[PDB]
Every structure is written in C-alpha cells, then in structure tokens.
Design a protein around this ligand. Sequence first.
Ligand code: MG
Ligand code: MG
Ligand code: MG
Ligand code: MG
Ligand code: MG
Ligand code: MG
Ligand code: MG
Ligand code: MG
Ligand code: MG
Ligand code: MG
Ligand code: MG
Ligand code: MG
Ligand code: MG
Ligand code: MG
Ligand code: MG
Ligand code: MG
Ligand code: MG
Ligand code: MG
Ligand code: MG
Ligand code: MG
Ligand code: MG
Ligand code: MG
Ligand code: MG
Ligand code: MG
Ligand code: MG
Ligand code: MG
Ligand code: MG
Ligand code: MG
Ligand code: MG
Ligand code: MG
Ligand code: MG
Ligand code: MG
Lengths: 122, 205, 129, 82, 80, 156
Amino acid sequence: ATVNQLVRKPRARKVAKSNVPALEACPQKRGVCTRVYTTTPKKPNSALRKVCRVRLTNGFEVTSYIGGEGHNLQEHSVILIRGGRVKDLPGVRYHTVRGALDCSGVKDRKQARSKYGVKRPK
Amino acid sequence: ARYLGPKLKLSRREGTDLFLKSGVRAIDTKCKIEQAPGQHGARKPRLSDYGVQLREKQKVRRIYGVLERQFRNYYKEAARLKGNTGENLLALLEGRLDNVVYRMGFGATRAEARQLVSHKAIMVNGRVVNIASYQVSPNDVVSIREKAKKQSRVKAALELAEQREKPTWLEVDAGKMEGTFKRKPERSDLSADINEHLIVELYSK
Amino acid sequence: SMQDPIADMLTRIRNGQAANKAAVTMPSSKLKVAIANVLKEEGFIEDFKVEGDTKPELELTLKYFQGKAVVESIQRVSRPGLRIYKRKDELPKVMAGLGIAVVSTSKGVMTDRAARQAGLGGEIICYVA
Amino acid sequence: MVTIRLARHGAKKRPFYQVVVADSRNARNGRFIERVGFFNPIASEKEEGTRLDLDRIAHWVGQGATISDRVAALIKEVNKAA
Amino acid sequence: KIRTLQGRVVSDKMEKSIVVAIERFVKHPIYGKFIKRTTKLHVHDENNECGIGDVVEIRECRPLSKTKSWTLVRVVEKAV
Amino acid sequence: ELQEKLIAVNRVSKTVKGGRIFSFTALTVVGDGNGRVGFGYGKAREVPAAIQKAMEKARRNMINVALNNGTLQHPVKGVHTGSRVFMQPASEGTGIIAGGAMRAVLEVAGVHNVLAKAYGSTNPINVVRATIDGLENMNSPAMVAAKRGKSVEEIL
RNA sequence: UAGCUAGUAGGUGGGGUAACGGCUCACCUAGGCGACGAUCCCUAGCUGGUCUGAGAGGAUGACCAGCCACACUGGAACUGA
RNA sequence: CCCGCAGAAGAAGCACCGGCUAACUCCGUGCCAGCAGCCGCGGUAAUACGGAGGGUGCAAGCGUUAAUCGGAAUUACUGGGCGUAAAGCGCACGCAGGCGGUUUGUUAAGUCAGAUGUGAAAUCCCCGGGCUCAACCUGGGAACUGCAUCUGAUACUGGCAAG
Ligand SMILES: [Mg+2]
Ligand SMILES: [Mg+2]
Ligand SMILES: [Mg+2]
Ligand SMILES: [Mg+2]
Ligand SMILES: [Mg+2]
Ligand SMILES: [Mg+2]
Ligand SMILES: [Mg+2]
Ligand SMILES: [Mg+2]
Ligand SMILES: [Mg+2]
Ligand SMILES: [Mg+2]
Ligand SMILES: [Mg+2]
Ligand SMILES: [Mg+2]
Ligand SMILES: [Mg+2]
Ligand SMILES: [Mg+2]
Ligand SMILES: [Mg+2]
Ligand SMILES: [Mg+2]
Ligand SMILES: [Mg+2]
Ligand SMILES: [Mg+2]
Ligand SMILES: [Mg+2]
Ligand SMILES: [Mg+2]
Ligand SMILES: [Mg+2]
Ligand SMILES: [Mg+2]
Ligand SMILES: [Mg+2]
Ligand SMILES: [Mg+2]
Ligand SMILES: [Mg+2]
Ligand SMILES: [Mg+2]
Ligand SMILES: [Mg+2]
Ligand SMILES: [Mg+2]
Ligand SMILES: [Mg+2]
Ligand SMILES: [Mg+2]
Ligand SMILES: [Mg+2]
Ligand SMILES: [Mg+2]
C-alpha cells in the first residue's frame, strides 16, 4: 500500500485459471468415448444423467455430458466436445455436441433444433 | 433485410398508429388498435425501465422500417455528431430517402415509397438514386421520373399526402412531381410523441 | 519524528476549525508563512502573526462565517513520501475552481489561478476548499 | 538508386497512386524517403486528381534521383496545365 | 559546449580506467515516486589521475575496449 | 411540481411464535425539479400502504440543493455507511449517466446533466442517502464568495 | 535460481578489420559483473499499431508498413560494391 | 453503367418467452424423461422439461463454444484495506534503503518556462472530396501525451558551506 512498498514489490494481477482446460483455448475438440455411463445428480436433484468419459486428441481424459433425450453412443465413438458444466454432475465440465461426427441429432425435436443438431422438418 | 409481416400487428403492439396503412380507412376499423397482439393482448403488465426504453426504440424502428444493425449505426453516427444525440438520430432517420419520398407524398406508406425507390422511380438531383438509406442533403431536388410519373399509385399517394399534414422542411410541386429538401428538420419540427431520450439511454447502457 | 511541517500546519488548521478554536499556533517557518500569506489573500483565514526571535511562533486567526468553518477541506498533496509537480497545463482546479490550490512556483508560493496566469507550474502543496 | 515513382493505393479497380521518393530496391508500397505528391487516375471532373510538389521533385532530381516514366508524364501534364 | 556527464568514481583499480556511477533521479512510471537510479560506466582515464570517491566529468568517445567507451574530461571535488 | 418515484420495494420478515410475519418497505424519492429533493422510507404490511407512508415522509424533510443551470456545481463525493458515491457535472446534452437509485434521486432533484458512479455497496437506501448528502453539501459560487469575504467575480 | 567470470576486466606491444574494439595473440596488472537482481531456469520475434476502458490501465502483435532472425539439420567459407 | 422483355413471379430463417431479461397459455410426462449462464426447475393441476398455439428479439443470418478487456474500487498510481469479516512480525536492536526541525549563502541535480530537432507512412479523430448510398478509397489538418539539446527561473526537494 505504501508507495515505497509498491515500488519494492508491485501489485500482482490475479491469474485466473480456465474452467475448461482440456479445450486448451479451442472452441471444440475431438475425442473417442472411452466409456459411456449414467450418474446420479447432486442433492437437490434426482436423475440418471448420461455422460461419457472421453480421451481427447490432445491426451486429456475428461468427462462429458450427453444432452438431449436418447443417444446412439458407445465405446469407440468419435465425438466433438464443447464447453459447459452440468452444475449438477460434480466434476463434469464439457458437453458433447449433438449433431457432430459419431453423435446423432436428437430424434423428433422441433424446437432448439440448432442446439441439438436436428435438421429442419418439412 | 425488411420486415414482411403484419403491420397493424406492429402498430397494436406499440400502441400508437405507426402509419403502416395509407390512412384511407381508420385504424380502429382495420384492427383492435387498443388491444395488443395475440392470445394475451387483453392484459397490460407493468413495464420495467428496460422494457419501456425497448418499446420506444421498437416504435421508432417500426415507424421508419430500419433493422437493428442499421439503427445502431445511425445512433453511433448521431452520438459522434455534435449536439444532442437523440435529436441527431431523429434528424438522420428523417433524412433517409424513403422517408423524404413519403413526406413529399410519392407513396401512401413508407413501404410504398421504399418500393418506388428500390424500383428506380426517384431521381435525386436528376440522378436516379436507388438506395433507401441514401441520406438526402439540404437543397436537394427529388423527383418522380416520367415512367413512374404515369403511375396511378403515385397520383393517389399525392392525394393522400394532401390530406395529411404537410412538412415544413420540404417544398413539393404536385404537377411537376418534384420536391426540394430545403433543410434537415429540427426536433421541434418533428413529432412530440417520440421520446428520443429513452433510445439514447438504451443504446448508452 | 516530525517529518512534514506543512502537513502538520494543515492538520492543525483542520483540527482548529473542527474544534471551533479561535487561533492555532505552530512553529514558524518561511514556507509556512508564505502558505499562510496565500491563505489570507484568498480569505480562508482571518490573519497570521509571527512572534518571537529565537524560535518564532506563527499564530493564525481562523475564520468562521455562519457558525461553521470557512475552510471546508484542506488536504496536503505533495508530501515527503511522494512529491507532486505539475506543468502549467496540468495544474488542478480544486472544487471546479471554487477552492484554491497552493502551488510553489519559481516565482514564489502562489495559488493555482495565479500560477496559471503567470504561466508556470510547480510543486502542488495542497488543495483548499 | 533513389527514384521517384508511383505507389499503388486505394481499392480494387480504383487505383490511387502516391508519388514517393524511394530507394529503387525497396518494394513498390514499402519503405520510401519522401512522399512528394499523388495521382488519381479515376478522378472525375471538378476534382484535382493530380498534385505534384514540383520544387521537391526538382530538388531530388538535382540530388541525382531518377524518375519513373509515368511520373515524368505526370510532370509534363502538370506543366502544360499550369 | 560538448555533451558530458558527471559522476562519482565507484572504483579505480583497473589501470588507466575508472568506474563512474551516474545516479539519475528519475520518476517512477506508475507510482510517481522519484527513485534514485544508477548508471555504472567504465571510463578511460590516462595517467590514472582519478581517485575513488572523486567526482568526475566524462564525455562519450569511440570505444577503447570491450566495455570502455567514455573518457574523462575534468575532475572536480577530488578530496579525500 | 413534486415529481415522485419509488426506487425499491423490498419484503422483510419478522419471526414470532406462530411463524413468520412479512411486511413491505418502500423507498421513494420526491423533488420539485428546481433543487429540492427528499427521500422517504415507509413500512407497512402491504405495498400500497408502505408506498403512501414513504411518500408522506419524503414530501416532508426535503432539502435544498444549489444547482447551476440544471447541472452540478462541482464534482462531489458522498458517503453513507457502505455507499460511497461520486458525481460530476457534465456538458449540456450528456443526460443523467447514473445508476438506479442514483438516477432516480438525481432526476427528481432536477439535475439534467450528470456523470455519476456508485462505489462501495449499492444498497438502494444507503446509496440514496449518500447521494442526497453529497448534493446537500455541494455549495455554489455565491456561497463560496460569502464565506471567503470576496465578490463572486474575484473567485469565478 | 546468490553468487558469476581466466580472454575473464584493464594496460603495453604485434597481427587483423572497410572500420573502433580481447576481434586475435604475447606479456603485465588483478581485475570485472552482482540485491538498481549478476548467473541460472521458463516463456517470447520487436515496433507503428489492434481490441477494450471515461481515463489510468489491461490484453495483444493476424492483415498493412518499419526493424530483426531463419531457409531440411549442423559447420564453413568463396565470389562480390 | 444504361436500355428493353415477361411475370409476384426465383428468394426467411434462428434463438428465446420463471427472475436477472423483451415475450404465456394448453396438452404430454410425474424427482422420470429431461433443462440450466447464475438462482434454480421436474415427486400427477410444470408460464422453467417435450409438443403445439400465441408472443418477443435479431434477420441472410441466428445461436452455442472458445478467447480478451469491461463491469471488477475483485492488486485499489488515479482508486481498497488489516480490533471482531482475509490481514500488525511474539518483542526488540540494527546495516542497506525510505523519510528529515530551523536560518543564510551558493549550486542548479529533481522541478518549472521557452525555443530547436525528432516523434516514418498507414491507423485514431476533425473539415472536405470520390465510388448511386454505405462499407471502402482519399485531400488537408489535429494528434503522436515521448525523447534529446540549448537558453532561462530558483519557491520547493537534492547537493555543498556556515549557523
Ligand atoms: Mg492459480
Ligand atoms: Mg430438484
Ligand atoms: Mg446486412
Ligand atoms: Mg591493439
Ligand atoms: Mg596495430
Ligand atoms: Mg518461439
Ligand atoms: Mg520467433
Ligand atoms: Mg474502470
Ligand atoms: Mg502469419
Ligand atoms: Mg542472415
Ligand atoms: Mg541459407
Ligand atoms: Mg520442410
Ligand atoms: Mg548450412
Ligand atoms: Mg557484383
Ligand atoms: Mg570478396
Ligand atoms: Mg419480463
Ligand atoms: Mg430451453
Ligand atoms: Mg398426467
Ligand atoms: Mg399438465
Ligand atoms: Mg426458464
Ligand atoms: Mg418449455
Ligand atoms: Mg480493475
Ligand atoms: Mg476490501
Ligand atoms: Mg481475523
Ligand atoms: Mg503486537
Ligand atoms: Mg528540511
Ligand atoms: Mg538523505
Ligand atoms: Mg535543470
Ligand atoms: Mg503517423
Ligand atoms: Mg460523399
Ligand atoms: Mg535550493
Ligand atoms: Mg537547499
């Protein structure tokens, strides 16, 4: 605080770590599903949330949510992951992209289709 | 790039008459102007500060037929220009070529005027200008070209305009079908129902 | 230790005004006298009086108007831990020109307005409002 | 050597040449010693379009500066017009 | 009038040469405090005339060694 | 002509043997648009009653403010316990560049051109209190002339 | 990361360079750098600028222009202004 | 770029609608399926999930993800703090360092003033001009808060001399 003190030792900028470090400042990244399973939510919620532990092209082993109702995923299924946490799966920091490589678009969706990789119905 | 939907729908939402119809027939006869559009029109929720500002901005945008990016650019230009920002914005909007054509009366609505301008019916200083956003300057003559001079729509529009209140900032010759844009209008010259201040606050959040 | 006599003087003035003291006394110095003179000229104090020979004492007579202190605020600016010097274009306007800023220039201690008129900057001693 | 030449500027299909003194080795729009005019080949009527600071050009030539053919033509035009 | 700098002789051991601190009283970029900064310079001095602690005026010249591109012009305040 | 506007309405609870007792507090601010501004803090079991109480309180205990041509007289700071506030006069046409509560208080007071910021806490009641205090303290050049025993022309 | 440096620091004399110079060599002196961070480690082309911000700052250095370095990797010179 | 031809003809989507945040209803499911930026929502009357109708916002784009600054006075020079919220070394001594009562003289290092040189062009900004308008291009200015040198002022700070 003292001007002398500042001169001696200046003020440190608060280095904020990223909350999506497997992306490595990429907007998406490709990976292979090591394992596909369901998991229980946190204490204000009950569900069986679909999630896949995925090995990324850059080495990282992350866990990724699978949004939408139903999915055509299994082991050795090449997917694109994006940023976003499930607040209620602890330690899940990434979403799968519905409507990418191995991942199919959601079946029978008419709204938020762009978010779930569904093509425009006739 | 243009709104192609229902116009009285827009008017009902705003509350006012936005002059989206020629004004032959009253808006009360063409629609429930008092009630807002849709299932939940018969309800007036209490509007937030943001909401009121947004509504005013929407009103002005609908009145002129400007989409948001263009409108924002207009606001920035106004802010840059010296003097009052809201006033400047209003002046720029007025300056637009489709608007001047409408004011002169070479179109019942601004939509009609815009159509004419796009379709190359309007000459600015003896030079066919095609852009509706073209800023008209002071002392600029703007005229119907002869091929569009035979248009029954143009003559009908002139009649309607004669019914309407004439603008002080233009001088128009009905037989010649030419009008001189003498000067950009002042805020006292434009309509009082527009609260430009709300727009300024909204784009200066 | 005493490390800033001007600051001490300013503090004394502030405390006197707070406490409704009629006069405030302190060890006199030439810089202090100059500052006091500037203050009197601008009308933030009623008077000053230097008294004594070996160790002289400055006695300022403080100024009140409606029961309350005339010098609303009085802050040191330049100080031993951190000197402040400004150029003529950078000279501050205290309270948007209502209050004065005592500036030590090459041509003696003067208010900011006077300094600006002359056309020279200097050590910004204090703001007074 | 030092030369006096046009540097292409403007937009596609709408060239605007800056007349610059420059060491011949340098690239067309690169490093240059002095900018001694401009030339606007699509300039309309009731527009100047050309402007060469002739005194500076004379000085550089005196120093020993070569002149581009186009720049020479421009100089000739300026002299005739004036 | 020639460009020249003054400084205290920090050392005079290396023969025909002295080291001359040229303290400058700069202001801090951010905090605005005035900090004493120092500039050591290897100065050439023929005849080994300078002592330690001596104030000395120096000018810049063609480099005389790996580190030595200054020469002394006049000594001042050469007390012990 | 006594323009008034309610800044914030907040529900507060008391606990009793039975259960919780809710009630509403309304912070309003009135002013004449020529200098006079006053805030009021009313409490009642229902919102309209609370607002009325607040309005009455605000209408009384107003305070005069030295305005120079619809703008501040000089840059002024103001504090009230957590709420430390800064507000600076600005050129005609700038508009009120001021937070929520702050914007309300300034507008009813009658300042048309200000640059404000609320530092510290932004708790509406405290922030309003801070702004009113700052506005009140702000003196005019006639005031400074009177204090220093000079003409206004000597001070400028 | 607290000590580092023997052509190391300076001198004299030869040689060398288009040019000053431990650039190089022989001898002499024992210096020189370092808490105003030497040395060591990690990262990085630099600038005009760019984005943001009321400003002070923060981040950044694609495009355009100035400077630098490199040309499969490691050395070397020749020709030549 | 202009002229002519035919005919509304060939040309509208994307997100969202519990609060923040502009925009609400019905049905389906029933802590499931699912949603989610935060707070949260769903356990059989869900404006929060999914469909529909209606609406809101942008529009040849609209969302999502990543990234930077802002808000964030949340590293606080401008512009924070430390009794109890995070924060006074357990206490002292003391080198470097930071700071220094009062008077006169001197110097002119800091400081201040003026000039000169430079601070490439582009960029930013101002007044113009050219593309039908805009973007874009462009003329002239302003700016480049800097650095250096010379000549001054000497109140303050520093140095030196005496008190
Ligand atoms: Mg960390
Ligand atoms: Mg739950
Ligand atoms: Mg577009
Ligand atoms: Mg030799
Ligand atoms: Mg030799
Ligand atoms: Mg690299
Ligand atoms: Mg590199
Ligand atoms: Mg800020
Ligand atoms: Mg590249
Ligand atoms: Mg090379
Ligand atoms: Mg090579
Ligand atoms: Mg290769
Ligand atoms: Mg090789
Ligand atoms: Mg050759
Ligand atoms: Mg050769
Ligand atoms: Mg709402
Ligand atoms: Mg949704
Ligand atoms: Mg059911
Ligand atoms: Mg139901
Ligand atoms: Mg919701
Ligand atoms: Mg829904
Ligand atoms: Mg900050
Ligand atoms: Mg704090
Ligand atoms: Mg504690
Ligand atoms: Mg203790
Ligand atoms: Mg002293
Ligand atoms: Mg000392
Ligand atoms: Mg000096
Ligand atoms: Mg430039
Ligand atoms: Mg033009
Ligand atoms: Mg002195
Ligand atoms: Mg002295």
